[PDB]
Amino acid sequence: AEFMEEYQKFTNESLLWAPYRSNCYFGMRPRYVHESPLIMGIMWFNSLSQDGLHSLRHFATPQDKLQKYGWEVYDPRIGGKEVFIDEKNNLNLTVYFVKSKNGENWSVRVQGEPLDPKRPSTASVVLYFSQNGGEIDGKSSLAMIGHDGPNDMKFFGYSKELGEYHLTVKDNFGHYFKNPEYETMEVAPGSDCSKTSHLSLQIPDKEVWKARDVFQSLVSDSIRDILERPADLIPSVLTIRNLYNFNPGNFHYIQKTFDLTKKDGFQFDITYNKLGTTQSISTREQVTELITWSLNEINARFDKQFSFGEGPDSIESVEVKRRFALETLSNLLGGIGYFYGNQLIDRETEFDESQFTEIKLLNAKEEGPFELFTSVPSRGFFPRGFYWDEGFHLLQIMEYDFDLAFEILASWFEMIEDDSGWIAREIILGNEARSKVPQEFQVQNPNIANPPTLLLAFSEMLSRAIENIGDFMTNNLEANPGLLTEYAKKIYPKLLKHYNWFRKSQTGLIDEYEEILEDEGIWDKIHKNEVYRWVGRTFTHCLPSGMDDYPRAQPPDVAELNVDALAWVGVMTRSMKQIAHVLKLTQDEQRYAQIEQEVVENLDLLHWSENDNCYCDISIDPEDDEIREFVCHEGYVSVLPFALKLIPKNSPKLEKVVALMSDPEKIFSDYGLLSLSRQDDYFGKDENYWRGPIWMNINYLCLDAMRYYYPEVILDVAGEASNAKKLYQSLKINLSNNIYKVWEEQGYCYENYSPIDGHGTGAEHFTGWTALVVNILGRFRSHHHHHH
Ligand SMILES: *[C@@H]1O[C@H](CO)[C@@H](O[C@@H]2O[C@H](CO)[C@@H](O)[C@H](O)[C@H]2NC(C)=O)[C@H](O)[C@H]1NC(C)=O
Ligand SMILES: *[C@@H]1O[C@H](CO)[C@@H](O[C@@H]2O[C@H](CO)[C@@H](O)[C@H](O)[C@H]2NC(C)=O)[C@H](O)[C@H]1NC(C)=O
């Protein structure tokens, strides 16, 4: 326990400070600080135009249509470099983040330059800071204590949680906008674009996220005052000022308007030093060497974890492939955020498992606070925790930073409350998070489950730890049985609660079929307790399966048994077996081992269709009742038993699944595996999400499964390619080539890809499970054997 607290202390300190407000282009708050956090964000716009406030950047949104934004290099333990290309605002913005070795001090360098040096424009950068908590704790504060000329400012702050600190904003260079042939640029007292403007005021903690709206509102009131006039005084008109004579408070705006016709651009530093620190960040030169050191250290960590060769993809060079992989991983890590607040949950409205109409949640309530440290599918579209997405994020994160993956996993399972094992599918905390979500999707339903991909990720992590440790650094939990055992003892009761909850809530009705299964002569050899159905499906959708519009049995029936629901129970059971092994719980381990084998046997006995050579959902013939029908829509659901490694090794069924995945007339394409066979009735129909398009998450599992079932495919030996090798190689090549190409051309990683011509579709900046392309390119010997 003492060793664990020593490890957890260091982990905490290394992850305390980072740009964890991932919904912002650049926003910061300290990890796990909910009462008195220092909150920071950066906004910018072109103040030279009359309607520059309409192009004010703050939150990441696809509606901004930036040419490019994201981390080129990033690791939240260290820092990184983020770039924003904004053609509308003529701005080429780079933001560096670095930290002291103990992680308690930090600096942000904002560096801008024009995209076109002869386009008349300005870069009006607005920093805001808020020391929260004062209204609650009666002590937390942040005050400007002085300045060195107009453009360098010194602040003193107190956070009850993090202690006293100094915050400084200082210019290194940059030409402030001004017409030299005027006596002054001022148009009103405080409205002067020729120097830094600062405004302090009191904003309630819960309203701090509205920094852009408050800014626009205050500037609008100043404009109203002014006009109740040359074009080059507009920047001064759009400079914030203390019009209403607010008393100083927790919140601070700092506005700097630079002339973008000067080619060299600008640079200023924002530095935070804990009071009494032995590692103060003190000079511009010190920041410059920290940035150089930090970027090198991240490149070194990346090179230790991944390795890249020439081929088999067609990416022009190994240097370019590696850089692509680094940027993609950096954006996945850069989506990691810290969230705190209430969910909207409806527990009162009655749930009827035998009805299939959409449900009206009319008894919604504020519940919480909750908190969560998690990666996100997309900073623009989906800047929040998604339960089923996170398992896939962790499969990528774990390959780079094993211990970080354990931090995120633990955070998720902290959300399990005492009376229930339920975890919401989508985690929306507070008004800031709700602002990105249509009201119709905000209210969560505690009767609805989702695929437990977190436990698939946990299974893969425990597999590596168990392999490496034998008998019972960013990978201490992989190598140290003492540390792993303490982590496991803490989390076990939570996983168990979740496991029991999932199994009960999704229990199928085996008692129908009995007469039918007796007639087939297999009723006696199936395991009646291991059959499952997705509870809460509707006529046209099945949200609990994670693949909403993947075709299901019609009409819906309470006797349906879903092959993918059973497969997921298999995966959960496997993870329980592994954590039981780690805890030396022999009798529990052997129970889970047998349950896993019973899942395996039910998949082959019940869900395998000899006629269709496929795993299928099953249902009772609505006409006949004496007949049970195999609902067979060939696609991701059909391959899931393969992709989750539940089919017995050497099973004759393996070859048929491989044949399914290799067939160009079904789900094989030049751009990866299609979610649904081209020959299916539903292919291309309706919203067309899981009815054709290629998704990286399932594609990656299939590749991983190939290596498990056909271990020879990992060797590239000259000779005759087996069917398994042909598939493995071409799929890996097709995914790598296409995801890169779309990223190179269309700009970024996408939620899914077109079966037509492989073009990117769905949400943009999807890192996101599409970041699993990093592993496909660079993963090497994640398994641990022996090097005698
Ligand atoms: C590691 O950091 C976290 C900070 O969240 C600590 O684990 C919160 O700690 C408080 C007080 O111990 C508890 O009330 C909460 O229940 C904890 N939450 C979670 C999610 O664990 C932990 O104490 C820190 N350890 C060290 C050594 O700093
Ligand atoms: C964004 O601005 C940066 C900074 O100037 C540019 O990346 C300099 O570019 C040259 C040419 O590649 C290199 O010699 C330097 O190493 C770069 N410096 C840094 C810090 O990257 C980049 O070209 C600009 N991008 C756009 C689209 O204008």
Curated annotation (Swiss-Prot):
Q: Consequence of mutating E751 to A/N? A: Abrogates catalytic activity
Q: Where, by residue number, does substrate bind?
A: N12, N92, E113
Question: Carries keyword Protein biosynthesis?
Answer: no
Localized where?
Endoplasmic reticulum membrane
The catalytic residues are: D548 (proton donor), E751 (proton acceptor)
Keyword Nucleus appears in the UniProt entry: no
Sugar attachment sites are: N12, N92, N105, N734
Q: Which cysteines are joined by disulfide bonds?
A: C616-C632
Q: Which reaction does it catalyse?
A: N(4)-(alpha-D-Glc-(1->2)-alpha-D-Glc-(1->3)-alpha-D-Glc-(1->3)-alpha-D-Man-(1->2)-alpha-D-Man-(1->2)-alpha-D-Man-(1->3)-[alpha-D-Man-(1->2)-alpha-D-Man-(1->3)-[alpha-D-Man-(1->2)-alpha-D-Man-(1->6)]-alpha-D-Man-(1->6)]-beta-D-Man-(1->4)-beta-D-GlcNAc-(1->4)-beta-D-GlcNAc)-L-asparaginyl-[protein] + H2O = N(4)-(alpha-D-Glc-(1->3)-alpha-D-Glc-(1->3)-alpha-D-Man-(1->2)-alpha-D-Man-(1->2)-alpha-D-Man-(1->3)-[alpha-D-Man-(1->2)-alpha-D-Man-(1->3)-[alpha-D-Man-(1->2)-alpha-D-Man-(1->6)]-alpha-D-Man-(1->6)]-beta-D-Man-(1->4)-beta-D-GlcNAc-(1->4)-beta-D-GlcNAc)-L-asparaginyl-[protein] + beta-D-glucose
For molecular function, the Gene Ontology terms on record are:
Glc3Man9GlcNAc2 oligosaccharide glucosidase activity
Membrane-topology annotation of the record: Single-pass type II membrane protein
The protein's PTM annotation reads: N-glycosylated.
Query: Its GO biological process terms?
Result: fungal-type cell wall beta-glucan biosynthetic process; fungal-type cell wall biogenesis; oligosaccharide metabolic process; protein N-linked glycosylation
Q: What's in the GO CC field? A: endoplasmic reticulum membrane; fungal-type vacuole
Q: Which Gene3D superfamilies match?
A: 1.50.10.10, Glycosyl hydrolase family 63, N-terminal domain
Q: List the stretches on the Lumenal face of the membrane.
A: 5-780
Pathway-wise, it operates in:
Glycan metabolism; N-glycan degradation
User: Any extra remark in the record?
Assistant: Present with 2840 molecules/cell in log phase SD medium.
**Function, in words:** Cleaves the distal alpha 1,2-linked glucose residue from the Glc(3)Man(9)GlcNAc(2) oligosaccharide precursor highly specifically. Seems to play a role in beta-1,6-glucan synthesis.
User: What's this protein's name?
Assistant: Mannosyl-oligosaccharide glucosidase
State the organism of origin. Answer: Saccharomyces cerevisiae (strain ATCC 204508 / S288c)
Q: What is the lineage of its organism?
A: Eukaryota, Fungi, Dikarya, Ascomycota, Saccharomycotina
